[PDB]
Amino acid sequence: MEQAMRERSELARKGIARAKSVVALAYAGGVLFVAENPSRSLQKISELYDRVGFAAAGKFNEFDNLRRGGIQFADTRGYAYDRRDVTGRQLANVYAQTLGTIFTEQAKPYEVELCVAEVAHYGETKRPELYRITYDGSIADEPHFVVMGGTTEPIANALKESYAENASLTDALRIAVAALRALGVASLEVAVLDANRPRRAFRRITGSALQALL
Amino acid sequence: MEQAMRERSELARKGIARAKSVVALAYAGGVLFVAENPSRSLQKISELYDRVGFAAAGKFNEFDNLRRGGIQFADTRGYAYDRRDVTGRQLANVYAQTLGTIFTEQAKPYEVELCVAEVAHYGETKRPELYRITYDGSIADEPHFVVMGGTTEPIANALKESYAENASLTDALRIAVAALRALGVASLEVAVLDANRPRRAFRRITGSALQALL
Amino acid sequence: MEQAMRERSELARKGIARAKSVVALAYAGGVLFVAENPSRSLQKISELYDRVGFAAAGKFNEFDNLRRGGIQFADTRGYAYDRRDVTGRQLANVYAQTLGTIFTEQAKPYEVELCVAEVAHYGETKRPELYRITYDGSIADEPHFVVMGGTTEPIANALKESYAENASLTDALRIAVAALRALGVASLEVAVLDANRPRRAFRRITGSALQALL
Amino acid sequence: MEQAMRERSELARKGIARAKSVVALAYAGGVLFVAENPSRSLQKISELYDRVGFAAAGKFNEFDNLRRGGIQFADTRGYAYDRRDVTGRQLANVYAQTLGTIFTEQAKPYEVELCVAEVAHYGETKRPELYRITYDGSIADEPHFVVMGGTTEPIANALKESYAENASLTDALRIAVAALRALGVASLEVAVLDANRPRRAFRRITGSALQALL
Amino acid sequence: MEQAMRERSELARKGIARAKSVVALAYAGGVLFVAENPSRSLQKISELYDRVGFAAAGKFNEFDNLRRGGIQFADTRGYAYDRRDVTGRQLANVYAQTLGTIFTEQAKPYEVELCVAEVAHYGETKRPELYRITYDGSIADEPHFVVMGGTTEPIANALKESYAENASLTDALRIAVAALRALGVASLEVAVLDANRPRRAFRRITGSALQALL
Amino acid sequence: TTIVALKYPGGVVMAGDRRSTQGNMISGRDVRKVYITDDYTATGIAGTAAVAVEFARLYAVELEHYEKLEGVPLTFAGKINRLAIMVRGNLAAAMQGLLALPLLAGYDIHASDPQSAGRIVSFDAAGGWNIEEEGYQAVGSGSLFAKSSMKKLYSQVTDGDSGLRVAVEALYDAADDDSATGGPDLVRGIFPTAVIIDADGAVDVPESRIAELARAIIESRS
Amino acid sequence: TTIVALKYPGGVVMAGDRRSTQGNMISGRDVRKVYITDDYTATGIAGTAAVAVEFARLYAVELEHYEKLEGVPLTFAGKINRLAIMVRGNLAAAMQGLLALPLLAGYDIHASDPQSAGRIVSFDAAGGWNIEEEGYQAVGSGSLFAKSSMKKLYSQVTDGDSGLRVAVEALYDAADDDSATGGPDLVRGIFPTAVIIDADGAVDVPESRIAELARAIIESRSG
Amino acid sequence: TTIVALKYPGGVVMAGDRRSTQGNMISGRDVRKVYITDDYTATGIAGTAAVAVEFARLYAVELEHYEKLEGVPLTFAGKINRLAIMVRGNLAAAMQGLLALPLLAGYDIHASDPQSAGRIVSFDAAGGWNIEEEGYQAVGSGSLFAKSSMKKLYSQVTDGDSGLRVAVEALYDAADDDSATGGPDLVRGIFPTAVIIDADGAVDVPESRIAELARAIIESRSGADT
Amino acid sequence: TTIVALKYPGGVVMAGDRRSTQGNMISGRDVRKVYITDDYTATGIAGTAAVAVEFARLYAVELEHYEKLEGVPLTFAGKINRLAIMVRGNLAAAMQGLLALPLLAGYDIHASDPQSAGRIVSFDAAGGWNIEEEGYQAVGSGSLFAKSSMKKLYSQVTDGDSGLRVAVEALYDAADDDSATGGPDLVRGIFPTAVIIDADGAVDVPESRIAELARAIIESRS
C-alpha cells in the first residue's frame, strides 16, 4: 500500500496546489485572515468559537464540512464543560485526528488545508496561536504566520521578508495582500480575531471598511 | 497475504524512520524523557497514571490517539479496581495488543513507536521499568534506556557508551541530549517520572527549570 | 486460495523460527517449564488453572491474547461446572479450535506455538500430560517433553539424548537449560507444575532460588 | 470462480489423503469402527446419539468441530421432539448441508471426511446404515463398509475381498485391522454400535479387552 | 463480468450433466415422477403440498435445501391465507427467484434442476401443470413432460416419440422407464401426484407395488 | 364446552359438543371442536375460540411439515411434545384470559400391543402433559360431569361402537348438568361431533350415527 | 406431593407418591415424580407439573450431553451445579406461580469411602443448594410429616432393604397427614415409585416390592 | 449527616461529621464525608453512602482524566458542570431512594481577585447548581441548624483559622440539634474532618487541630472557660 | 444468621453460625457461612442462601482470575471494590427479596504495621462499603446482640486464641437472644465455623477447638 497512500497524498497535494491562497498573520490587534476569494457568499474564513477562528484552502464542500464539524465540536464542548474550556489547540488536535481518519479511510482524501487560530481572552496577555493542519492530519503550530493553498513558496517568502511582529491592522493587511500577490475588495475575503472584543473576537472586514484599510 | 504484511511493515517502518527522535533513561530519581520537539503545545511525552509515563515517536495524530486510549484504559482500570492495581507492564501489554490489531486490520498501519515507563511508588525500592512497543505490537522491556524515532543507531550507541546507572538528573540530561545530537529549550520536550513525588510522579521540566539542568 | 494457505503457513512458520525457545519436561515433581526470556515482567509461561499450565513461543501480543483467552475459558468452565471438570486436554482442544479459526480467517495468522500441560491432582497418580498446539491448530500430545520456538532440532535432540523419565527438579532443570543452549537467572523464565501442591500447582522459580539450581 | 472451486477441492483432497485411515463395518452385532490412532486422548470415533455413531478422518480441530455440532444438533432435536425421532439419516443430511456450506463459503474448506452410522433400536430388526459425507457435502449411503482418510484404495479392495456380511465382532475386527494394514492396541482406536444394548449402543473397546480381541 | 457468469453457468451445467436423470409425465391419473436412484433413503422426489410435487436432479445437499425451502414456503402461505391458495405456479415462481439469487450472489451456483408439478383438486377438471426451473432461475412450463439431469437429449427424444396424452399409470411408467434407459425397483424412485385423492395427492410407489406396475 | 375421549379395544374415540356462550347468552349452536390433525391423531380444544382454532390448524400444519421435511412422521411422543410446546407458547396470553386447553387422542402405530395402542393425552396451561392411564378423560366446563358419568359407564366399553355410545352419553350428561355445554338438538338436527381412531386411521363419525345414539339415550331416560 | 430420599450404608434411596390435585380435587393417581437422570443419579421434583417434567428431562439430557462432548461424566459437584443453575433459570416463572423444586439423590463414584458415597441434595427456588448431612431429606406438601417420621425411623436403616422400607413408611405417614400426598392404593394397585442407587448404579425398584412393603406397614398399623 | 463550607479571605474551608445511622441506630462513627477531588477542590456529600462514595471517586477520576487528555485542568465552571451532570445522571435512582447531594468547595486559580477566589457550590437532585454568594452553605439532615449557626458566627471569620473554628462550631451546633449528625467524640477521640483550600492548594486539616477547636467550643459552653 | 469478625494483634478472625430457618421452622443445622476466598481473605454472608453461595464462589473465582491474568493479586482496596461492585450488581434482585450482605475479613500483606494489618469490611445492599475501625463487626439477624457482647468482651482480646474465644462467645450470645441464629449443638456435635487469618494466611479453625471453646462458655454460665 506504499503506493496507495502515495497516490492519496498526490491527489490531495495537487488539489490544494490548484486552489486559491490564504494567509493568517499575528498582529498587535489579534489575528488577521486574508484569502483570495471572488465569491460574494461562499466563505473560506469563519468563526469557530469565542476566541477561535478558522481558515481553509482547497475543495469548498470538503473544508466546509470540516468547518461545520469544528463548530459542532466547539459548541458541544463548551456546553458539556464551560466556554473557557474550548481552545484552538483542542480544535486543531481534533482536526488532525479527523483528517488523519479521512486520509486513510475515506474513498478519496480531503483536498484541504486548515488553519486554526486563537487570540487572548479579553484583558489577558497571551501570544496568538496559529495551527496548520494538512490533508493527512499532520499538524504544526506557527509563531507568526500561516500560508495555505496554491503556490505557497512565493507568498511565504514575501511574508518571511516583510513580516513584522505586532504590526498594526493596516500594515498587516498590506503585508498580507502583497505577499498574496506573489487585489481589491471584490476578490478578497478578510476577517480578524480581535483580542480587544469582550467575547466574540471574530469580525469580518468588508465593503467600505475594507476599502479604507487598503 | 505474506507480501501484504511485508508492505504494511515497510510503510510503518519508513514513517517511523522519518520522524524526530525520543529517548527515555532510567536514573537515580526516576525516569527521564527527552524528545526533539519544536512545537510549543503539541506533546509527545505524557502522563498516563500515578507512576506511569508515555513517550512516542512518529505520526502525531496516531500516537495521540494511543495516548488518549491508554489514559482511558488506565483511569478505567484504576476506578474498577484500585489505583495501585494499574501498572506500566499492564499498559505496555495493552498497547502491544492494540498496535498488533491496528497493524493487521486497520486500513493503514500506525506509524508509531511507544515507550511506557514506570517508577516505584513513594517510599518503595523498585527498579524503574521501561517498555518499548513497536508498530506491529512487538514488545520489549529495557533495563536502562529506550530510543525511538528517526535514525536510532547513533543515538543508541552514544547511550550505550555514556550511560551510567543511577546518574543525577543533570548528568542524565547531558547524556540524553548529547546522544540525541548524533537542541535548546526551544527544540526540546522534557519530563520526568519523579519517584520522590507522593502520588503523581510525572512532571514537565520547562523554561527556567529546564535551564538549571542544561 | 491454495497459494494463500501456503503463504499463511509460511508466515507463521518463519515467525516462530525467529523467536526464542521454550521447553516443557515431565519430571519427578511435575512439569518443568524453561524459556529463554530476557524480560523480567513480560512472561511466556503462565498458570491456566489449578493443575494446568501454559507456555508459548512467538509473537508476545498474540500468545498473550491466547493466554488470557485460556484463563477466561478455564475460569468460566470451572464456575459453570466444577473446578475438577477443567482439564489440560479440554484447554488444548480449545486452543486447537481457536488457532485453527485464526489461521484461516484472521487477516494474519498468529505466529505462535503453545504448550498446555497438566499434572495429577494432589495425592493422585497420573502421568503428566503435555500438549503442543501449532499455528494452524494442529495438536499433539507428547509423553516426555515439548520444544517450541526458534531452531528446535538441536534442542529436541539434545533432549532426546539426555532426557530421563522421573528426574529430580535440579537434574531436569540442567538437562533443559543445556538442551536450550544448543543462560543465567537473568535470561531465563522458570516455573513448575508441582503435583505436590494441594490445589494450585503452578509456581515460579526466580532469583536466589533459581540460582541455587543452576 | 471455476478455478477457485478446483483449488478448494484440491486442498481438501490432499489434506485428507495425508491423514490416517478409518473404516466402519456393518456386522452381526452392529457397526464396528476402527481407526489408526496413536493418541491416548484425542478421538476420531464418537457417540452422537442413542443408536448413532460418528467417525472422521482428516484435520482434528475441524472434524471435532463437526462432531460437537452434530451432538448439539442431535440432543436439541431429541429434546424438541423425542429421542426416537433422531436418526442417522437426519444427521448425515445435516452434515452434508454443513460441509457444503463450509466448502463454498468458509475461508478454507474443511479437510475432513465423515461417517455417520446407525444400528437398530433394542429388539428391532433393521440393517445397519452407513453414510459417508465428504468435504464438499457429497453424501452416499453404503451397505457394508466405509473407508476414509489416507490411501483408501488398498484398504477398500482388501475389504471388498475379505468382507463377509454378519461376521462376528472378532472376525470383523480382524478383517478391518488387516484391510487397514494395506497395529496394536497402542495405535488403534476401536468402538462399536452394539445393537444389543438397551439404549446407548456406543461402546469403546480398549486396553485388555481390545488386546484380548487382537 | 461476462466470463464470471459464463464460468458459473458452465460449472452448474457440468454438475447437472454429471447427475442421474429424472422425468415427470402428465397422465390420466395426474403427474408421474420417475428418477434413477440407487439410494434406499435419500430422495429426489417429494411432496411439497396437497396437490403439488417436487423432483430434482443434481447435487443432493443443494436440491434438498431447496426442497425444504419450498415446503417451508408452501406451509407458511397455506397457514397465512388458505391451503387452496397455494399453487404449483406459486412455488415454481418462488424457486425461479431463489435460484436466480443463488446463481448471481452465492459463492458457488447451485448445481440443480427442479421440477414443480400440480394436479387438479379432488373432483375438478384441470390439466396437470409441469414447471421446470434451471440453475440460473430460468423457468418454463411444459404441457406433457419434463426431463432433468444427465444427458437429457436421448431421454427427451424417446419421450417425444412414445409419449401419449392421458396414458394409464402402467403405460406411463413403462414409457418413462424406457425413455430413461436411453432398471429395477432397486434403482428407481417412483411417486405420483394422484388426482383421485381427496387432499394429499402425493404417494410413493415402492417395493412390491412398483414391481407389479412394472 | 365439553370434550371427551376414551380408549376402547383397538382404538380411541373423541367427541365434543357444539355450543358457545357469551356469558349466559347462547352465541353458537354448531361449533366444531374436534379436529383430525393427522392420519392417526385428533385434537379437541376447550376455551377461547380464537386460540382453539389456531392450535388445531397450526398443529396439523406442524405435524405434516415435519413429515414432509424428514420423510417420516413424528413418533407419538414427539407429537405430544410439539403440542405441549405450542400450548406453553400461549401461556402469557392465557394469563391475560386467552386460555385454551387441548385434549389429544391418537393411535400409536409403533406400539407393541395394537389392542391398547390408543392414546389419550391431556394438557395444562403451562405446557404440562399427561398420558392418561385410566381409559378416559375430558376437558371443558362440563368435564367433571362427563368424567363422573364415564366412571360409571366405562365398564360397558368393549368395542368402537360401545365406546362411541359411552362418549355420546357422557356428553349428554355434561350438557344435562352444565349450561355451557350443548345437548343434542333434535329440532335443528345438530349433534355432537366425533372422531374414531384405529389401526386403519382417524375418521369422522357420521352425524347420522351420533343422532341415532342420542335418540336411544333420550328414549332410555324418558 | 411428597418426595423422600435417604442414605443407607452403600447407597441412597428415593421415593415419591403418585397424586396430583387441582385444589381439593384429585386430578391424578399415577403421576411418576422420580426419574433416573443418569447412571448414578435420580431426581424427584415437587411443584408445578409442567416445570417438573421439563427439569427432569432437560437435566438428564444435559448430563449426557456433557459426557458425549467431553468423554467423561460431570463430577458430582458439577451435576449439582447444573441442576442449581437450571432451577435458578426458572426463578422468574416461579415467582409467577410456576414453582418446582428438585431433590437430587446420587452415588458419587469418585468418593473415598463407598459406604457413605450416597448423596442427597436439596434446592431452593433461587438455585440455592445444600448437600444433606443428616441422612435424609424430603420435599413437597407432606415433607414435614415425612421428615418427622424418618427422624424416628432412620435408626432402623442398616441396608438397602430397610432403607427402602423406611422411605415407603415415611411416604405412608406423609399421605396419612397430608391430603395432597397419595397413599398406597390397594384397590387400584398403585404404589409410590422408588429408585435405589449404589455402586452398581441407579435402578428402578419393582412395584411388587413396594406393594409388599405397603401391605406390611398397613398390617402393622391395623395391629 | 451535616457538611458545611465557608469562604474566608484567601480561601475556603469544608468540614463534615462522622456519623451514619440506620433509622435510630448508630451504624457508624468514623465515616469520612469530605474528599479532596483535585488540587483545588473538595467535595462533601450527604445522603446514600454507596452513591456518595461513587460520586467522590468517579468525579476525582473524571477531573484528572480531562487534565491528562487535554494537558490542562478544567476551568472551575467546567468542574461545576461535570459534577452537576453526574448528579443528574443519578436522578432516576434518586427517585427510588438512592439520593445523594454534593457540596463543592474550591479555589479558582483563574479568578481575578485571589482574596475572593474561594468558591462554594450547591447541587439539587436534578443537577441544578448554585454558586453561593453569601459566604457559606451546608447540606444534610443538620444543614438548617448549621446555617442558622453560621448566620450568627460568620462575621467572626477573618482568616483560615477563624474560618475553620466557625465551621467546626457550626458542625457542633448541627450535632447538638440533629441526632443524625455526630458531635466530637472525646471518649473515642473521633472528630469531624476538614479540608482547607487556598492558593497553595487543598489540604486535609490535621485531626489534632480540629480536636483542639472542639475542646475550646465545649469548654466555652460549659462555662469551664469561666 | 449471625456472622462476626474481629481484629486481634497480628490478624483477624471470622466466625459464623450454622442455622437456617424458613419462617419459624428450622430448615438447616449445618450451613457453612464462612468461606476462605483467597490466601488472605475470608467472606461471611448473611441473607438469601442462593445469593450468598453465588457471592462467595464467584468472588473467589474473580480474585484468582485477576491474579492469573495479571501475575499479581489485587491490592486489598481492589478486593474490597470488586466485592462491593458484585453486591451492587444484586441490588435489583435484593429489592425483590433476594438480599444478601457479605462481611469481609482479611490480612493486608502490603500494610506497614503487621500488628494491625487485619482488615474488616462491611457492605450495604447498594454496594456501600466501610473499613471497620473499631475492632469488630457483625452481620445478620443476631448481629446487634453479638456486637453488644463484643463491646464488653473485646478488651480481653490480646491474641488469636482470645480473639477466637470472644468471637465464639459473641456467636453464643447472638444465638441466646436470636432464634434465627444457632447455638452450639452438643447433642449432634455441630458448632460454629471459623477462619483465622494472619501473616501465614487464612486457615480454617478445627471444629475440635471451637467445640472446646463452646463447652467452656457453657460451663462458665452454668
If you ran DSSP here, which 8-state letter would residue I140 be given? S
Residue D152's nearest CA partner among D42, D36, D46 is D36
Residue D169's nearest CA partner among D32, D24, D23, D22 is D32
Q: What distance in Å separates the CA atoms of residue C181 and residue H49, rounded to the nearest whole number?
A: 61
Angle between helices H49-70 and B60-80 (to 10 degrees): 160
Q: Which run of H or E residues covers position I132?
A: none
Nearest C-alpha of chain A: how many angstroms from B197? 28
If you ran DSSP here, which 8-state letter would residue A58 be given? E
What residues of F are in the E interface, CB distance below 8 Å?
A: 57-58, 61, 64-65, 68-69, 71
- Exposure string for D12-48, b = 16+ CB within 10 A, e = fewer: bbebbeebbbbbbbbbebbbbbbbbbeeeebbbbbbb
Q: What distance in Å separates the CA atoms of residue F131 and residue G30, rounded to the nearest whole number?
A: 10
Interface D:F, Cβ pairs < 8 A: 25
Whole-number Cα distances in Å, B202 to B91, B177, B195, H57, H90: 16, 20, 9, 21, 34
Q: Which of H28, H30, H50 sits opposite I127 (nearest CB)?
A: H50
Residue G164's SS3 state is helix
Nearest C-alpha of chain F: how many angstroms from D198? 16
Q: What distance in Å separates the CA atoms of residue H16 and residue H19, rounded to the nearest whole number?
A: 9
Q: Which of B43, B47, B79 sits opposite H57 (nearest CB)?
A: B79
Interface test with A, best of B61, B105, B112 (most A CBs within 10 A): B61
Residue F124 in contact with residue G49, Cβ under 8 Å? yes
What residues of C are in the G interface, CB distance below 8 Å?
A: 80-82, 84-85, 90
Whole-number Cα distances in Å, B200 to B121, B168, B204, H75: 9, 20, 12, 20
Q: Which of A100, A129, A140 sits opposite B62 (nearest CB)?
A: A100
Residue I192 in contact with residue I19, Cβ under 8 Å? no
Residue H141 in contact with residue H180, Cβ under 8 Å? yes
Q: Is G1 a catalytic residue?
A: yes
What are φ and ψ of residue A5, in 5° steps? -60, -30
Residue D145's SS3 state is strand
Residue H61 in contact with residue B79, Cβ under 8 Å? yes
Q: Inter-chain contact B71–H69, Cβ cutoff 8 Å?
A: yes
Using left for φ > 0, alpha for ψ between -120 and 50, and beta otherwise, residue F13 falls in: beta
Q: Give, rounded to a whole angstrom, the gap between the first and last alpha carbons of chain F.
A: 25
Q: Inter-chain contact G70–C80, Cβ cutoff 8 Å?
A: no
Nearest C-alpha of chain F: how many angstroms from G49? 6
Concatenated DSSP letters of I84-109: HHHHHHTHHHHHTT--EEEEEEEE-T
D93: chain E residues, CB-CB within 8 Å: 61, 64
What residues of I are in the H interface, CB distance below 8 Å?
A: 84, 88, 124, 126-130, 133-134
Residue D112 in contact with residue D96, Cβ under 8 Å? no
Q: Which of C1, C97, C129 sits opposite D61 (nearest CB)?
A: C97
- The residues, any chain, with a CB within 8 Å of residue H171's CB and separated by 6 or more, are H2, H4, H15, H16, H17, H142, H146, H181, H183, H192
G61: chain D residues, CB-CB within 8 Å: 75, 78-79
Q: Which run of H or E residues covers position E32?
A: strand E32-36
Q: What distance in Å separates the CA atoms of residue I102 and residue I83, rounded to the nearest whole number?
A: 8
Q: Which run of H or E residues covers position E212?
A: helix E207-213
Q: Which residue has the cell 410439539?
A: F82
Residue B72's SS3 state is helix
Q: Inter-chain contact I82–B85, Cβ cutoff 8 Å?
A: no
- The residues, any chain, with a CB within 8 Å of residue G115's CB and separated by 6 or more, are G9, G10
Q: What distance in Å separates the CA atoms of residue H21 and residue C107, rounded to the nearest whole number?
A: 59
Residue C174's nearest CA partner among C138, C212, C144 is C212
Interface test with I, best of B73, B76, B77, B81 (most I CBs within 10 A): B81
CA-based nearest residue in chain B for residue A2: B11
Residue E82 in contact with residue E157, Cβ under 8 Å? no
Residue I193's SS3 state is strand
Q: Which residue has the cell 473544508?
A: A63
Mark whether A and I touch (3+ CB pairs within 8 Å): no
Residue A37's nearest CA partner among A158, A153, A184 is A184
Q: Which of B11, B41, B64 sits opposite A5 (nearest CB)?
A: B11
Q: Among the residues of D110-168, which ranges form H helices?
A: 152-162
Residue E63's nearest CA partner among E34, E22, E25 is E22
Report residue I27 as a C-alpha cell.
430448615
Return the ∠ at Cα G203 (arms to G201 and G208), rounded to 5°.
Answer: 155
CA-based nearest residue in chain C for residue G78: C81
What are φ and ψ of residue H204, in 5° steps? -70, 135
Residue I103 in contact with residue I122, Cβ under 8 Å? yes
Q: What distance in Å separates the CA atoms of residue F202 and residue F219, rounded to the nearest whole number?
A: 30
By DSSP bridging, strand I129-131 and strand E22-25 are: unpaired
I25: chain G residues, CB-CB within 8 Å: 144
Whole-number Cα distances in Å, C69 to C16, C76, C91: 20, 11, 10
Report residue F18 as a C-alpha cell.
357444539
Q: Which of I29, I31, I51 sits opposite G126 (nearest CB)?
A: I51
Residue A120 in contact with residue A195, Cβ under 8 Å? yes
Q: Inter-chain contact G61–D43, Cβ cutoff 8 Å?
A: no
Q: Which of G57, G58, G65 sits opposite D71 (nearest CB)?
A: G65
Q: Give, rounded to a whole angstrom, the gap between the first and last alpha carbons of chain E.
A: 50
Q: What distance in Å separates the CA atoms of residue A197 and residue A210, rounded to the nearest whole number?
A: 18
Residue D128 in contact with residue D30, Cβ under 8 Å? yes
Angle between helices C60-80 and I49-70 (to 10 degrees): 160
What's the distance, CA H85 to chain centroid? 19
Angle between helices C60-80 and C88-105 (to 10 degrees): 130
Residue F100 in contact with residue F45, Cβ under 8 Å? yes
Residue B153's nearest CA partner among B175, B180, B176 is B180
G82: chain C residues, CB-CB within 8 Å: 81
Concatenated DSSP letters of E178-202: HHHH---GGGEEEEEE-SSSSS--E
Angle between helices E60-80 and F49-70 (to 10 degrees): 160
What's the distance, CA D74 to chain centroid? 16
Whole-number Cα distances in Å, H89 to H42, H51, H82, H85, H93: 20, 11, 11, 6, 9
Residue G125 in contact with residue G96, Cβ under 8 Å? no
Whole-number Cα distances in Å, B154 to B157, B161, C94: 5, 10, 47
Interface B:I, Cβ pairs < 8 A: 22
Q: What distance in Å separates the CA atoms of residue I146 and residue E207, rounded to the nearest whole number?
A: 86
Q: Among the residues of G71-120, which ranges form H helices?
A: 76-89, 91-95
Name the β-bridge partners of I70. none
What are φ and ψ of residue D10, in 5° steps? -65, -40
Q: What distance in Å separates the CA atoms of residue D151 and residue I95, rounded to the nearest whole number?
A: 67
By DSSP bridging, strand A202-204 and strand A188-194 are: antiparallel
Q: What distance in Å separates the CA atoms of residue B52 and residue B193, rounded to the nearest whole number?
A: 7
Residue D119's nearest CA partner among D12, D187, D31, D20 is D31
Residue H95's nearest CA partner among H126, H127, H123 is H126
Residue E48 in contact with residue E71, Cβ under 8 Å? yes
If you ran DSSP here, which 8-state letter would residue G39 be given? T
Report residue I74 as a C-alpha cell.
489485587
Name the β-bridge partners of G185. G190
Q: What domains are defined for chain F?
A: 1-222 (3.60.20.10)
**Sign of the four-CA dihedral D101, D106, D108, D110:** negative
What's the distance, CA D31 to chain centroid? 10
Q: What domains are defined for chain C?
A: 1-214 (3.60.20.10)
What are φ and ψ of residue G17, in 5° steps? -80, -175
C137: chain D residues, CB-CB within 8 Å: 59, 61
The upper half-sphere exposure of residue E187, i.e. CA atoms within 13 Å in the direction of its Cβ, equals 8
If you ran DSSP here, which 8-state letter would residue C178 be given? H
Concatenated DSSP letters of chain F: --EEEEEETTEEEEEE---EEETTEEEES----EEEEETTEEEEEEE-HHHHHHHHHHHHHHHHHHHHHHSSPPPHHHHHHHHHHHHHHTHHHHHTT--EEEEEEEE-TT-S-GGG-EEEEEE-TTS-EEE--SSEEEESTTHHHHHHHHHHHGGG--SHHHHHHHHHHHHHHHHHH-TTS---BTTTTB--EEEEEESS-EEEPPHHHHHHHHHHHHHHH-
Residue I185 burial class via C-beta count within 10 angstroms: exposed 0-12, middle 13-18, buried 19 and up: middle
Residue I94 in contact with residue I86, Cβ under 8 Å? no
Return the ∠ at Cα F35 (arms to F33 and F40), rounded to 5°.
Answer: 145
Residue E117's SS3 state is strand
Interface test with D, best of G68, G70, G72 (most D CBs within 10 A): G68
Q: What distance in Å separates the CA atoms of residue D26 and residue D193, rounded to the nearest whole number?
A: 9
A85: chain H residues, CB-CB within 8 Å: 74-75, 77-78
Report residue F9 as a C-alpha cell.
379395544
Angle between helices E88-105 and E60-80 (to 10 degrees): 130
Q: Give, rounded to a whole angstrom, the gap between the first and last alpha carbons of chain I.
A: 25
Interface test with D, best of E20, E64, E108, E187 (most D CBs within 10 A): E108
Amino acid in the structure at residue D33: F
Name the β-bridge partners of F26. F21
For the CA atoms of A73, A79, A82, A85, the dihedral, rounded to the nearest 10 degrees, stands at -10
What's the distance, CA D185 to chain centroid? 19
- Exposure string for H64-82, b = 16+ CB within 10 A, e = fewer: bbbbbbbbebbbbbbbbbb
Nearest C-alpha of chain B: how many angstroms from H2? 27
Residue H226 burial class via C-beta count within 10 angstroms: exposed 0-12, middle 13-18, buried 19 and up: exposed
Amino acid in the structure at residue H124: D
Residue C188's nearest CA partner among C164, C169, C162, C214 is C214
Report residue F38 as a C-alpha cell.
393427522
Q: What distance in Å separates the CA atoms of residue E119 and residue E166, rounded to the nearest whole number?
A: 13
F129: chain G residues, CB-CB within 8 Å: 50, 53
Interface test with B, best of I75, I110, I112 (most B CBs within 10 A): I75
**Residue of F1, F2, F41, F48 with catalytic role:** F1
- The residues, any chain, with a CB within 8 Å of residue E210's CB and separated by 6 or more, are E185, E188, E190
Angle between helices C88-105 and C2-16 (to 10 degrees): 120
Cβ neighbour number for residue B208 with a 10 Å cutoff = 8
Residue B78 in contact with residue H58, Cβ under 8 Å? no
Q: Among the residues of chain A, which ranges form H helices?
A: 2-17, 60-80, 88-105, 152-162, 169-181, 207-213
Q: What distance in Å separates the CA atoms of residue A210 and residue C67, rounded to the nearest whole number?
A: 69
If you ran DSSP here, which 8-state letter would residue A83 be given? G
Residue D53 in contact with residue D117, Cβ under 8 Å? yes
Concatenated DSSP letters of C35-79: EE---SS--SEEEEETTEEEEEEE-HHHHHHHHHHHHHHHHHHHH
Residue H11 in contact with residue H197, Cβ under 8 Å? yes
Q: What distance in Å separates the CA atoms of residue C88 and residue C84, rounded to the nearest whole number?
A: 11
Q: HEC string of chain H?
A: CCEEEEEECCEEEEEECCCEEECCEEEECCCCCEEEEECCEEEEEEECHHHHHHHHHHHHHHHHHHHHHHCCCCCHHHHHHHHHHHHHHCHHHHHCCCCEEEEEEEECCCCCCHHHCEEEEEECCCCCEEECCCCEEEECCCHHHHHHHHHHHHHHCCCHHHHHHHHHHHHHHHHHHCCCCCCCECCCCECCEEEEEECCEEEECCHHHHHHHHHHHHHHHHCCCC
B107: chain A residues, CB-CB within 8 Å: 104-105
